[PDB]
Amino acid sequence: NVHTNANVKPKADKSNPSHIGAQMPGSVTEVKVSVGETVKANQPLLITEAMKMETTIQAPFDGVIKQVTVNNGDTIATGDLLIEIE
Amino acid sequence: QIKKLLVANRGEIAIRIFRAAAELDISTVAIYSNEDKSSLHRYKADESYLVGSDLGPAESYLNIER
Amino acid sequence: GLSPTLRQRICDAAIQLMENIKYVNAGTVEFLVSGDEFFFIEVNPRVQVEHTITEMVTGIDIVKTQILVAAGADLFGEEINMPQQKDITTLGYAIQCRITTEDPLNDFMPDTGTIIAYRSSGGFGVRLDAGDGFQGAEISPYYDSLLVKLSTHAISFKQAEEKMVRSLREMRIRGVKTNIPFLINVMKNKKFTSGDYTTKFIEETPELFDIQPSLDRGTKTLEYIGNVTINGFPNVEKRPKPDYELASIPTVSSSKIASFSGTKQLLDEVG
Amino acid sequence: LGYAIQCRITTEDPLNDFMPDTGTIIAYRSSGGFGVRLDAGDGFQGAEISPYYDSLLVKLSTHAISFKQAEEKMVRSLREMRIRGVKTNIP
């Protein structure tokens, strides 16, 4: 592509605790976890930039990251799947 | 009895001399270096000529022969 | 500051030299004065940067005269129009201030850069011989970084002072940080106005290195607006500027309000 | 000391009954130099000229030892002047 800004992300299924969805339209500023990792509850796994403002996305529980749908500097839309955990 | 005059200089003094010369109905000539391509003085004269493009703007205003 | 018959001797001293050696065209004769004694230092066989100052008090265009002299024209003829030596005098007093990139915040080091804004002056007898400072033109470290020569002229030394002060305060050069604030203090100096100052005047007057934090609020709000226009604002969704609804503001006069008496006034009476 | 000369640069058309021309100035240059004094009015590269006030773009005054010198200084400055977008009384 030349970067990954054209990439369409699947929508997170809302009634599945494994699926973490994008809460706002933002930009992925920093990816912090990869496929097959295990960190504690509240682990800062993704850093988005909403609109000049920055929030870390945290894990709701303990578990193993199955998929990360995004890369650094990627645009996101409300309801976009970002992370899946076990 | 002078018809046309060249200023071996740049900056405000060159402008000043051009004006003095123009007041005496004397045609004027400006010399400029490679970095003085945008020096105001280059434009305030009847003729503009580059002093050595192969002789850096460091040396330009001091080269007697050119 | 100097005595009247002193400068005559210094002038005569100069004339005696230049007439003895058959000097042609414009030249300066430098001296060093102490008490009541001239001392020859050097001769500058050309015009000096500070020629304007003398042209303003005598009334002669020095530069013009150079060309005509070179043209073979006579000193007291129809061209040069020079007055006889007994007719040449000085009207009022003139001053010249030098404006260069040289940092007073960094031991007078000439600065390489591109100017972002330049702002002139004007007024009765205010010469603005502009060299390096005009548009958004980059300057080279290879040349004497003369930004602007600044000259004023008036019958009073005090009046030529305040003429220089206003011009200095009206100046605006950004990107580089100039010798301006320094120069203003020199013009508001009782020992400068007095007349008697040495070539040591600066070093022994340390409060001339006293800088005032003069803000350019206009520049600052242009910078704010620019930044927000281009980069947006935190928590504000990038969209078309409001004043969509031009609902003008109801207002009431100060007079009316100055008369109003309510619970504020009550507190002031009863407590 | 010396002689001084003044004239006022206006938008009066010297070909058309000295009638004040109106409109926008799209290019403005000015002289200066020793013994030349410019007191600007409506003459600048920005705004347009309304017919409602007396016409005056620049008050131009010059000063030299001789009168003839003062004149040749005045002439040059007039020629050095550049004003586009309106007719002027310069010529």
XYZ file of C-alpha atoms in Angstrom:
514
model
C 0.000 0.000 0.000
C 2.668 2.467 1.158
C 1.865 2.498 4.897
C -1.443 0.843 5.933
C -4.001 3.683 5.777
C -6.335 2.107 3.165
C -6.933 -0.975 5.341
C -10.519 -1.809 6.305
C -10.943 -3.282 9.805
C -13.729 -5.719 10.752
C -16.329 -4.535 13.266
C -15.929 -5.826 16.819
C -18.832 -8.048 17.859
C -20.214 -6.121 20.842
C -21.583 -9.077 22.856
C -18.215 -10.898 23.014
C -15.808 -10.126 25.894
C -12.849 -11.324 23.781
C -13.398 -8.485 21.286
C -12.225 -4.954 22.173
C -13.721 -2.218 19.967
C -12.666 1.324 19.099
C -14.658 3.773 21.230
C -13.936 6.906 19.140
C -12.490 7.874 15.739
C -8.740 8.101 16.412
C -5.221 7.312 15.242
C -3.036 4.475 16.483
C -0.057 6.306 17.991
C 1.791 3.324 19.504
C 1.265 -0.450 19.301
C 2.514 -2.115 22.523
C 1.549 -5.804 22.208
C 1.962 -8.517 19.568
C 0.198 -11.808 18.711
C 0.835 -14.413 21.452
C 1.592 -12.235 24.508
C 0.437 -12.397 28.139
C 0.340 -9.419 30.534
C -1.619 -8.619 33.762
C -5.068 -7.025 34.098
C -4.998 -3.321 33.107
C -1.996 -3.845 30.769
C -1.498 -0.810 28.469
C -1.694 -2.681 25.137
C -2.516 0.133 22.657
C -2.114 3.943 22.551
C -4.649 5.905 20.487
C -4.908 9.632 19.765
C -8.564 10.708 19.643
C -8.148 14.405 18.684
C -4.854 15.788 20.035
C -5.764 13.783 23.151
C -4.195 10.457 24.079
C -5.631 7.419 25.924
C -4.119 3.990 26.536
C -6.437 1.021 25.913
C -6.333 -1.454 28.819
C -7.142 -5.170 29.110
C -10.338 -5.903 31.084
C -8.845 -9.103 32.557
C -5.872 -11.483 32.428
C -5.282 -13.440 29.209
C -3.526 -14.045 25.885
C -3.683 -11.629 22.934
C -5.050 -13.557 19.944
C -5.086 -10.697 17.379
C -4.058 -7.046 16.955
C -5.956 -5.474 14.049
C -3.818 -2.314 13.755
C -0.326 -0.879 13.168
C 1.342 2.405 14.214
C -0.189 5.515 12.622
C -3.356 3.729 11.489
C -6.732 5.477 11.362
C -9.628 3.882 13.300
C -13.441 4.268 13.306
C -15.979 3.849 16.125
C -16.735 0.134 16.638
C -13.585 -1.060 14.847
C -12.037 -4.229 16.259
C -8.615 -3.527 17.756
C -7.694 -6.412 20.084
C -8.899 -9.903 20.991
C -7.922 -11.553 24.314
C -8.740 -14.845 26.123
C 32.504 64.035 -17.629
C 30.836 60.703 -16.730
C 28.216 58.777 -18.748
C 27.917 55.444 -16.892
C 29.111 54.442 -13.427
C 29.611 51.061 -11.734
C 29.500 50.544 -7.960
C 32.143 48.118 -6.720
C 29.844 47.425 -3.770
C 26.510 46.127 -2.445
C 23.929 47.110 0.208
C 22.600 50.585 1.103
C 25.727 52.435 -0.015
C 25.277 51.078 -3.547
C 21.640 52.285 -3.584
C 22.777 55.675 -2.273
C 25.395 56.029 -5.039
C 22.929 54.921 -7.745
C 20.521 57.614 -6.561
C 23.268 60.239 -6.521
C 24.271 59.178 -10.039
C 20.675 59.165 -11.318
C 20.398 62.731 -9.995
C 23.288 63.644 -12.310
C 21.779 61.780 -15.282
C 24.406 59.031 -15.025
C 23.689 55.445 -16.104
C 24.472 52.947 -13.327
C 25.811 49.398 -13.074
C 25.498 47.004 -10.130
C 27.696 43.999 -9.415
C 26.289 41.155 -7.339
C 27.585 37.904 -5.867
C 25.888 34.508 -5.954
C 24.229 35.153 -2.584
C 23.311 38.749 -3.418
C 21.040 37.594 -6.250
C 18.225 38.930 -4.003
C 19.996 41.979 -2.519
C 17.787 45.050 -3.111
C 20.813 46.933 -4.539
C 20.890 44.618 -7.603
C 17.524 45.995 -8.712
C 18.037 49.712 -8.002
C 20.385 50.078 -10.998
C 20.245 50.311 -14.807
C 22.491 47.288 -15.311
C 23.018 44.112 -13.281
C 25.930 41.673 -13.697
C 27.061 38.618 -11.730
C 30.558 38.653 -10.236
C 32.066 35.185 -10.720
C 29.652 32.278 -10.360
C 32.736 30.017 -10.176
C 34.267 32.369 -7.588
C 32.237 32.032 -4.358
C 30.265 35.015 -2.959
C 32.947 35.067 -0.229
C 35.592 36.361 -2.668
C 33.373 38.122 -5.265
C 33.438 41.819 -4.279
C 37.255 41.708 -3.863
C 38.350 40.215 -7.206
C 39.902 43.182 -9.019
C 40.083 41.681 -12.546
C 36.493 40.372 -12.868
C 30.601 69.098 24.958
C 33.870 70.319 23.417
C 34.889 74.010 23.628
C 34.197 76.255 20.565
C 37.847 77.116 19.700
C 38.904 73.473 20.225
C 37.085 72.040 17.177
C 38.491 74.880 15.029
C 42.012 73.641 15.817
C 41.018 70.037 15.084
C 39.472 71.087 11.761
C 42.493 73.281 10.944
C 44.759 70.361 11.871
C 42.869 68.241 9.327
C 42.932 70.957 6.633
C 46.673 71.489 7.182
C 47.349 67.815 6.495
C 45.100 67.328 3.461
C 46.079 70.611 1.791
C 49.783 69.843 2.323
C 49.544 66.567 0.386
C 47.152 67.693 -2.409
C 44.167 65.522 -1.430
C 41.514 64.864 -4.060
C 37.923 63.779 -3.339
C 36.348 62.727 -0.022
C 38.434 61.710 2.996
C 38.207 61.536 6.790
C 40.961 62.594 9.223
C 40.753 60.712 12.538
C 41.994 62.106 15.847
C 42.188 61.333 19.563
C 41.239 64.063 22.014
C 42.249 64.490 25.642
C 42.103 67.791 27.552
C 43.020 70.362 24.900
C 45.234 68.390 22.486
C 44.597 66.881 19.028
C 46.464 63.646 18.142
C 46.466 62.288 14.571
C 45.344 58.663 14.446
C 44.510 57.699 10.839
C 43.126 58.802 7.470
C 40.248 57.003 5.775
C 40.698 57.719 2.062
C 37.018 57.331 1.075
C 33.508 57.885 2.478
C 32.609 56.365 5.843
C 29.372 54.583 6.780
C 28.497 57.498 9.083
C 28.717 60.236 6.389
C 24.942 60.936 6.462
C 25.175 62.448 9.945
C 27.441 65.254 8.666
C 25.438 65.673 5.452
C 22.412 66.421 7.639
C 24.038 69.257 9.643
C 26.121 70.909 6.905
C 23.560 70.433 4.129
C 25.979 68.966 1.585
C 25.458 65.703 -0.259
C 28.909 64.181 0.243
C 28.343 61.180 -2.070
C 26.994 63.337 -4.925
C 30.040 65.602 -4.548
C 32.419 62.639 -4.930
C 31.099 61.815 -8.418
C 31.236 65.444 -9.600
C 34.802 65.856 -8.254
C 35.739 62.687 -10.163
C 33.978 64.240 -13.180
C 36.489 67.115 -12.963
C 33.909 69.664 -11.772
C 35.062 72.593 -9.603
C 34.385 72.707 -5.851
C 32.709 76.151 -5.920
C 31.024 75.866 -9.340
C 27.505 75.345 -10.728
C 27.721 71.579 -10.179
C 29.045 70.940 -6.643
C 27.604 74.279 -5.356
C 29.779 74.089 -2.229
C 29.719 77.166 0.000
C 33.001 78.936 0.792
C 34.749 77.609 3.920
C 33.575 80.646 5.963
C 29.973 79.893 4.883
C 29.907 76.197 5.819
C 28.389 75.590 9.277
C 26.258 73.135 11.208
C 22.494 73.418 11.578
C 21.290 71.494 14.649
C 22.650 68.138 15.817
C 22.518 64.710 14.167
C 23.006 61.195 15.579
C 23.608 57.781 13.962
C 22.751 54.385 15.517
C 24.032 51.060 14.186
C 21.669 48.079 13.958
C 23.338 44.688 13.390
C 22.339 41.018 13.931
C 25.020 40.767 16.648
C 23.479 39.241 19.795
C 23.639 41.370 22.954
C 22.358 38.142 24.584
C 25.429 36.354 23.137
C 28.768 38.301 23.091
C 28.121 40.304 19.862
C 28.228 37.324 17.460
C 26.800 38.063 13.962
C 23.844 35.753 13.305
C 23.093 33.628 10.228
C 19.368 33.466 9.427
C 16.312 34.553 7.445
C 14.219 37.520 8.672
C 10.497 36.769 9.159
C 9.363 40.428 9.395
C 10.756 43.953 8.870
C 9.085 47.255 9.878
C 10.397 50.732 8.916
C 10.031 54.199 10.474
C 9.803 57.703 8.960
C 9.327 61.252 10.274
C 11.152 64.600 10.251
C 14.814 63.932 9.406
C 14.914 60.148 9.886
C 17.298 58.434 7.439
C 16.777 54.687 6.979
C 19.760 53.436 4.938
C 18.541 49.815 4.665
C 20.996 47.090 3.601
C 20.343 43.543 4.833
C 16.859 44.063 6.340
C 13.913 44.413 3.931
C 11.790 41.354 3.010
C 12.256 37.680 3.929
C 15.821 37.580 2.600
C 18.457 35.308 4.166
C 21.734 36.992 5.167
C 25.258 35.587 4.786
C 27.813 35.356 7.631
C 30.499 36.395 5.075
C 29.387 40.066 4.965
C 29.347 42.745 7.679
C 25.840 41.981 8.981
C 24.610 45.585 8.761
C 20.837 45.327 9.059
C 20.023 49.053 9.245
C 21.717 52.432 9.674
C 19.460 54.781 11.639
C 19.957 58.571 11.539
C 17.980 61.491 13.024
C 18.354 65.282 12.808
C 17.069 68.285 14.843
C 18.151 71.731 16.211
C 18.222 70.331 19.750
C 20.388 67.426 20.899
C 17.468 66.464 23.164
C 15.131 66.693 20.142
C 17.442 64.554 17.988
C 17.574 62.134 20.935
C 13.800 61.634 21.250
C 13.640 61.376 17.440
C 16.058 58.445 17.621
C 14.198 56.904 20.574
C 10.810 56.810 18.793
C 12.390 55.387 15.630
C 14.164 52.743 17.742
C 10.889 51.813 19.473
C 8.993 51.669 16.155
C 11.508 49.162 14.754
C 10.523 45.531 14.476
C 12.999 42.848 13.484
C 12.239 39.227 14.321
C 13.994 35.887 13.839
C 17.208 37.485 15.091
C 17.455 39.359 18.441
C 19.014 42.789 17.845
C 20.967 45.547 19.655
C 17.859 47.808 19.851
C 16.970 47.749 23.617
C 20.604 48.524 24.410
C 20.590 51.557 22.073
C 17.454 53.069 23.668
C 19.204 53.245 27.077
C 22.148 55.101 25.515
C 19.718 57.721 24.170
C 18.064 58.152 27.581
C 21.451 58.729 29.263
C 22.238 61.916 31.218
C 25.973 61.495 30.550
C 25.314 61.002 26.832
C 23.054 64.074 26.690
C 25.595 66.063 28.752
C 28.218 65.693 26.025
C 31.292 64.490 27.921
C 31.775 60.752 27.378
C 34.967 58.742 26.858
C 35.639 55.849 24.463
C 35.278 53.892 27.718
C 31.686 55.142 28.204
C 30.153 51.706 27.520
C 32.331 49.425 29.696
C 32.041 51.701 32.762
C 28.254 51.915 32.332
C 27.106 48.308 32.951
C 23.366 49.134 33.208
C 23.334 49.598 29.406
C 23.264 45.791 29.174
C 19.868 45.951 30.930
C 17.237 44.310 28.679
C 13.444 44.759 28.942
C 11.116 41.841 28.027
C 9.224 43.736 25.277
C 6.481 41.366 24.116
C 5.125 41.415 20.564
C 1.548 40.358 21.379
C 0.422 40.773 17.750
C 3.025 38.270 16.561
C 1.945 35.953 19.365
C -1.749 35.925 18.412
C -0.899 35.476 14.717
C 1.163 32.486 15.868
C -1.702 31.114 17.988
C -4.334 31.448 15.263
C -1.937 29.949 12.728
C -1.158 26.964 14.928
C -4.812 26.179 15.671
C -5.979 26.706 12.073
C -3.407 24.232 10.781
C -3.101 21.775 13.696
C -6.534 22.014 15.344
C -7.415 22.277 19.037
C -7.464 19.535 21.758
C -10.925 17.910 22.101
C -12.330 19.960 19.208
C -13.574 18.058 16.163
C -11.992 19.474 12.954
C -14.973 21.248 11.301
C -16.169 24.590 9.763
C -15.696 27.663 11.956
C -18.819 28.922 13.834
C -20.336 32.412 13.860
C -22.847 30.360 11.904
C -25.582 32.120 13.945
C -24.861 35.894 13.881
C -27.071 36.615 16.933
C -25.970 40.122 18.013
C -25.443 40.910 21.675
C -27.972 42.870 23.761
C -26.250 45.684 25.654
C -26.857 48.240 28.434
C -24.955 51.515 29.100
C -22.324 52.023 31.821
C -24.154 55.124 33.026
C -27.370 53.213 33.794
C -25.410 50.459 35.580
C -23.284 52.971 37.535
C -26.613 54.131 39.023
C -27.991 50.654 39.828
C -28.238 49.859 43.498
C -28.700 46.228 44.512
C -27.338 43.632 46.924
C -23.707 44.757 46.389
C -24.558 48.258 47.597
C -26.620 46.691 50.379
C -23.542 44.849 51.683
C -21.655 48.167 51.542
C -24.303 49.866 53.773
C -25.553 47.274 56.264
C -22.920 44.497 56.161
C 20.384 76.125 4.761
C 19.839 75.291 1.084
C 16.510 75.183 -0.756
C 13.504 72.865 -0.381
C 10.829 71.807 -2.895
C 7.436 70.152 -2.352
C 4.691 68.705 -4.526
C 1.796 66.320 -3.874
C 1.312 63.087 -5.828
C -2.442 62.705 -6.462
C -4.798 60.602 -8.621
C -5.627 63.583 -10.866
C -5.422 62.563 -14.536
C -3.316 65.242 -16.287
C -4.821 64.143 -19.619
C -8.412 64.150 -18.323
C -9.215 67.540 -16.697
C -7.248 66.686 -13.495
C -10.203 64.576 -12.344
C -9.477 62.384 -9.308
C -9.305 58.748 -10.479
C -10.648 56.032 -8.124
C -10.028 52.332 -7.480
C -7.351 49.976 -6.184
C -3.543 50.305 -6.204
C -1.998 46.954 -7.232
C 1.678 48.034 -7.203
C 3.329 50.740 -5.115
C 7.002 51.664 -4.952
C 8.625 54.711 -3.377
C 11.934 56.567 -3.327
C 13.807 57.965 -0.311
C 17.481 58.725 0.306
C 19.343 61.724 1.739
C 17.311 64.953 1.568
C 14.120 63.245 0.364
C 11.029 63.159 2.572
C 7.912 61.091 1.873
C 4.685 61.747 3.766
C 2.320 59.018 2.553
C -1.464 59.394 2.488
C -3.627 57.040 0.418
C -0.611 55.768 -1.554
C 0.170 52.167 -0.534
C -0.104 48.714 -2.157
C -3.180 47.772 -0.129
C -6.514 49.578 -0.060
C -8.591 51.302 -2.734
C -9.192 55.042 -3.197
C -12.561 56.570 -2.352
C -13.567 59.781 -4.187
C -14.831 61.348 -0.931
C -11.727 63.183 0.339
C -9.112 65.399 -1.303
C -6.765 63.337 -3.452
C -3.290 62.726 -2.005
C -1.162 59.627 -2.469
C 2.221 60.985 -1.302
C 3.474 64.345 -0.148
C 6.964 64.583 -1.669
C 9.561 67.082 -0.388
C 13.268 67.366 -1.301
C 16.200 69.370 0.132
C 19.718 70.220 -1.174
C 22.416 72.942 -1.059
C 21.457 74.521 -4.378
C 17.940 74.896 -5.757
C 18.851 73.146 -9.016
C 20.216 70.198 -6.980
C 16.965 70.110 -5.006
C 15.086 69.970 -8.330
C 17.136 67.129 -9.866
C 16.566 65.229 -6.605
C 12.842 65.872 -6.881
C 12.742 64.790 -10.551
C 14.523 61.481 -9.843
C 12.154 60.638 -7.000
C 9.144 61.321 -9.229
C 10.629 59.015 -11.886
C 11.577 56.422 -9.258
C 7.923 56.363 -8.086
C 5.839 53.449 -9.318
C 2.070 53.381 -8.869
C -0.202 50.986 -10.774
C -3.993 50.656 -10.881
C -4.817 54.375 -10.900
C -3.814 57.341 -13.058
C -1.507 59.791 -11.230
C -0.358 63.388 -11.699
C 3.298 62.268 -11.742
C 4.150 63.005 -15.442
